[PDB]
Scaffold this motif. Structure first.
Motif, PDB file in Angstrom:
ATOM      1  N   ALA A   1       0.515  10.002  -5.558  1.00  0.00           N
ATOM      2  CA  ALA A   1      -0.906   9.803  -6.104  1.00  0.00           C
ATOM      3  C   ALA A   1      -1.507   8.759  -5.754  1.00  0.00           C
ATOM      4  N   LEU A   2      -2.896   8.822  -5.997  1.00  0.00           N
ATOM      5  CA  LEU A   2      -4.156   8.342  -5.188  1.00  0.00           C
ATOM      6  C   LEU A   2      -4.595   7.442  -6.111  1.00  0.00           C
ATOM      7  N   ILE A   3      -4.605   6.006  -6.298  1.00  0.00           N
ATOM      8  CA  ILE A   3      -5.424   4.979  -6.769  1.00  0.00           C
ATOM      9  C   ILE A   3      -6.487   4.732  -6.356  1.00  0.00           C
ATOM     10  N   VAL A   4      -7.424   4.372  -7.308  1.00  0.00           N
ATOM     11  CA  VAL A   4      -9.262   4.089  -7.404  1.00  0.00           C
ATOM     12  C   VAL A   4      -9.176   2.996  -7.793  1.00  0.00           C
ATOM     13  N   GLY A   5     -10.282   2.221  -7.220  1.00  0.00           N
ATOM     14  CA  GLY A   5     -10.922   1.750  -7.619  1.00  0.00           C
ATOM     15  C   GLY A   5     -12.839   1.790  -8.032  1.00  0.00           C
ATOM     16  N   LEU A   6     -13.163   1.743  -8.560  1.00  0.00           N
ATOM     17  CA  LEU A   6     -14.754   2.054  -9.267  1.00  0.00           C
ATOM     18  C   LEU A   6     -15.807   1.477  -9.918  1.00  0.00           C
ATOM     19  N   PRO A   7     -16.104  -0.188  -9.549  1.00  0.00           N
ATOM     20  CA  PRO A   7     -15.904  -0.784  -8.210  1.00  0.00           C
ATOM     21  C   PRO A   7     -14.368  -1.690  -7.848  1.00  0.00           C
ATOM     22  N   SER A   8     -13.822  -2.036  -7.130  1.00  0.00           N
ATOM     23  CA  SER A   8     -13.015  -3.131  -7.155  1.00  0.00           C
ATOM     24  C   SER A   8     -12.610  -4.113  -7.674  1.00  0.00           C
ATOM     25  N   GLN A   9     -13.843  -4.305  -7.062  1.00  0.00           N
ATOM     26  CA  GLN A   9     -14.367  -6.543  -6.573  1.00  0.00           C
ATOM     27  C   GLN A   9     -13.242  -6.588  -5.156  1.00  0.00           C
ATOM     28  N   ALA A  10     -12.558  -8.196  -4.821  1.00  0.00           N
ATOM     29  CA  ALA A  10     -11.614  -9.027  -3.931  1.00  0.00           C
ATOM     30  C   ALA A  10     -10.932  -8.680  -5.384  1.00  0.00           C
ATOM     31  N   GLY A  11      -9.843  -8.609  -3.721  1.00  0.00           N
ATOM     32  CA  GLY A  11      -8.652  -9.090  -4.718  1.00  0.00           C
ATOM     33  C   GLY A  11      -7.495  -7.389  -4.524  1.00  0.00           C
ATOM     34  N   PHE A  12      -8.528  -6.520  -5.147  1.00  0.00           N
ATOM     35  CA  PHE A  12      -7.951  -5.144  -5.275  1.00  0.00           C
ATOM     36  C   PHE A  12      -6.378  -5.124  -5.406  1.00  0.00           C
ATOM     37  N   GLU A  13      -6.218  -5.052  -3.725  1.00  0.00           N
ATOM     38  CA  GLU A  13      -4.549  -4.264  -3.234  1.00  0.00           C
ATOM     39  C   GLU A  13      -3.631  -5.503  -3.279  1.00  0.00           C
ATOM     40  N   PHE A  14      -4.042  -6.464  -3.228  1.00  0.00           N
ATOM     41  CA  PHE A  14      -2.845  -8.193  -3.329  1.00  0.00           C
ATOM     42  C   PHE A  14      -2.239  -7.953  -4.415  1.00  0.00           C
ATOM     43  N   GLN A  15      -3.035  -7.526  -5.915  1.00  0.00           N
ATOM     44  CA  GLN A  15      -2.487  -7.240  -6.981  1.00  0.00           C
ATOM     45  C   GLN A  15      -1.944  -6.032  -7.236  1.00  0.00           C
ATOM     46  N   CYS A  16      -2.390  -4.787  -6.496  1.00  0.00           N
ATOM     47  CA  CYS A  16      -1.304  -3.731  -7.028  1.00  0.00           C
ATOM     48  C   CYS A  16       0.036  -3.707  -6.080  1.00  0.00           C
ATOM     49  N   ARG A  17       0.154  -4.431  -5.523  1.00  0.00           N
ATOM     50  CA  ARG A  17       0.984  -4.852  -4.152  1.00  0.00           C
ATOM     51  C   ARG A  17       2.474  -5.486  -4.879  1.00  0.00           C
ATOM     52  N   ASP A  18       1.700  -6.818  -5.591  1.00  0.00           N
ATOM     53  CA  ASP A  18       2.584  -7.458  -6.653  1.00  0.00           C
ATOM     54  C   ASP A  18       3.123  -6.760  -8.271  1.00  0.00           C
ATOM     55  N   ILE A  19       2.667  -5.864  -8.620  1.00  0.00           N
ATOM     56  CA  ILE A  19       3.004  -5.503  -9.418  1.00  0.00           C
ATOM     57  C   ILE A  19       3.939  -4.269  -9.413  1.00  0.00           C
ATOM     58  N   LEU A  20       3.230  -3.587  -8.666  1.00  0.00           N
ATOM     59  CA  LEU A  20       4.743  -1.719  -8.011  1.00  0.00           C
ATOM     60  C   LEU A  20       5.636  -2.172  -7.319  1.00  0.00           C
ATOM     61  N   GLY A  21       5.725  -3.252  -6.918  1.00  0.00           N
ATOM     62  CA  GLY A  21       7.218  -3.067  -6.188  1.00  0.00           C
ATOM     63  C   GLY A  21       6.634  -2.841  -4.936  1.00  0.00           C
ATOM     64  N   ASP A  22       7.942  -1.707  -4.354  1.00  0.00           N
ATOM     65  CA  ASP A  22       7.934  -0.766  -3.207  1.00  0.00           C
ATOM     66  C   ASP A  22       7.695   0.295  -3.852  1.00  0.00           C
ATOM     67  N   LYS A  23       6.843   0.919  -4.851  1.00  0.00           N
ATOM     68  CA  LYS A  23       6.284   1.867  -5.134  1.00  0.00           C
ATOM     69  C   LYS A  23       5.490   2.007  -4.719  1.00  0.00           C
ATOM     70  N   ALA A  24       4.548   0.681  -3.928  1.00  0.00           N
ATOM     71  CA  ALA A  24       3.360   0.331  -3.591  1.00  0.00           C
ATOM     72  C   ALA A  24       2.647   1.107  -2.556  1.00  0.00           C
ATOM     73  N   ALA A  25       3.642   1.183  -1.467  1.00  0.00           N
ATOM     74  CA  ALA A  25       4.117   1.274  -0.246  1.00  0.00           C
ATOM     75  C   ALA A  25       4.437   3.263  -0.418  1.00  0.00           C
TER      76      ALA A  25
END
Ligand SMILES: NC(=O)c1ccc[n+]([C@@H]2O[C@H](COP(=O)([O-])OP(=O)(O)OC[C@H]3O[C@@H](n4cnc5c(N)ncnc54)[C@H](O)[C@@H]3O)[C@@H](O)[C@H]2O)c1
Length: 403
Positions: A109-133
């Motif tokens: 899957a491709l996950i998109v922020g429109l618009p993202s604002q600041a800290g988008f990537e840090f939040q995604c990594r924390d909640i999804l875990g290993d799947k985020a890689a």
């Protein structure tokens, strides 16, 4: 068939859903989690088609009509089997969507922020875990259109469309649909999209300090006496406010240079002065451009824009509590401060605006130069999730000891 899920139900979500569903070979699903908003939408539309009205450069108007596959609150129906997932909402609502999609999202899957604002990537990594890689993460600079709803669930109007727009990308281990060409297909001829060099470039070029600085320049040392009417907003600044903007921009450059020296191979060279930015994009609208003070005050696009006010004894007074501070501080300025601490760079001008603004809304984030405030858990700074080093910020991996 390309399968697309849109998250939200406001001005932006109405426009995107109508345009995408009009393309041959695409299936669209809509998901919203705000109480029973999905049932309200379905009942109002009925058997009719959704309409988008587009204002052109000639002065004419064009209509677009289509119908989505499903509109629901159930994540199992909306997320399962999707190739692209796009979030278009205010930033405080992002946490809810990440939690709901976790058990159903596929590796490619491709996950998109429109618009993202600041800290988008840090939040995604924390909640999804290993799947985020395994998945990919894509972040846009702002919204593609200026738009407003005319009739809930039935009609929306586009007032204007940007000519160009940029986005950053982090690639994972799984192969996805081509990011740049797929997104272009859904939107049409305009705007023309391009790729940025680095995700930290996109983060700091947000210029989060702009609106808090304009409010501080006018009401900073207010005595409490009312004024006759609402004063101008961009075109009302003084020389002292212009010097404040230059100092905050210089601090953005100091942070970028420190990261490149400590971590070789990361290209952050497209980070630029704010004065350089104004002349490159607003050249046709500016009357006098010899310095930053004259470039802002003589900009034709800022004609007639004023401060928010309310009625009081013998005049009007400034109206705080909207979203100029409630979004731009915890989802903006605070995130930038966390990055600076990890790099070891002092930022005295940015610090001064943070301490003044948090008091006006009744919140606490920064205390004696440290991130130990009462409401610190409601922000997106990297330290909130346990990413404490520059290596952890870049890769998403934490260090472990061995006996
Ligand atoms: N619309 C524009 O012309 C424009 C232009 C440039 C940038 N933007 C930015 O784009 C972003 C999205 O714009 P928009 O106009 O679509 O936003 P919007 O205000 O229209 O979005 C409202 C939607 O957000 C959700 N929502 C609102 N409050 C909620 C809550 N209390 N709990 C759960 N969900 C809630 C609901 O689904 C609601 O339908 C904003 O950050 C805005 O600043 C907008």
């Amino acid at each position: 068939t390309v399968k697309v899920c849109v998250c939200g139900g406001g001005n932006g979500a109405h426009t995107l859903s109508g345009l995408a569903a009009s393309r041959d070979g695409v299936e669209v699903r809509v998901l919203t989690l705000f109480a029973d908003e999905a049932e309200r939408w379905t009942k109002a539309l009925g058997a009719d088609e959704l309409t988008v009205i587009v204002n052109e450069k000639d002065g004419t108007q064009t209509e677009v009509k289509s119908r989505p596959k499903v509109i629901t609150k159930d994540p199992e129906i909306a997320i399962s089997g999707a190739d692209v997932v796009i979030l278009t909402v205010p930033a405080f609502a992002h946490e809810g969507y990440f939690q709901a999609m976790a058990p159903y999202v596929q590796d490619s899957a491709l996950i998109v922020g429109l618009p993202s604002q600041a800290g988008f990537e840090f939040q995604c990594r924390d909640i999804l875990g290993d799947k985020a890689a395994a998945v990919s993460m894509m972040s846009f600079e702002t919204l593609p259109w200026a738009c407003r709803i005319k009739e809930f669930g039935r009609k929306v109007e586009v007032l204007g469309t940007k000519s160009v727009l940029a986005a950053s990308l982090i690639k994972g281990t799984a192969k996805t649909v081509d990011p740049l060409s797929t997104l272009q297909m859904l939107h049409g001829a305009e705007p023309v999209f391009r790729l940025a060099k680095h995700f930290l470039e996109m983060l700091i070029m947000s210029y989060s300090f702009v609106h808090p600085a304009i409010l501080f320049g006018r009401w900073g040392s207010w005595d409490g006496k009312p004024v006759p009417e609402a004063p101008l907003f961009y075109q009302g600044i003084d020389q002292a406010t212009a010097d404040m903007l230059t100092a905050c921009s210089n601090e953005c450059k100091d942070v970028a240079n420190a990261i490149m020296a400590a971590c070789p191979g990361n290209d952050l060279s497209d980070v630029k002065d704010i004065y350089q930015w104004y002349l490159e994009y607003y050249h046709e609208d500016i009357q006098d451009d010899h310095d930053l003070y004259h470039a802002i005050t003589t900009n034709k696009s800022y004609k007639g824009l004023v401060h928010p006010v309310k009625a009081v004894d013998g005049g009007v007074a400034p109206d705080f509590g909207n979203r100029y501070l409630t979004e731009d501080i915890p989802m903006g300025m605070i995130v930038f401060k966390g990055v600076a601490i990890a790099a070891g760079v002092a930022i005295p001008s940015n610090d001064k605006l943070i301490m003044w603004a948090q008091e006006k809304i009744g919140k606490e984030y920064l205390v004696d130069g440290a991130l130990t405030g009462k409401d610190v858990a409601t922000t997106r700074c990297p330290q909130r999730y346990g990413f404490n080093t520059l290596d952890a910020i870049l890769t998403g991996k934490k260090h472990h000891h061995h006996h």
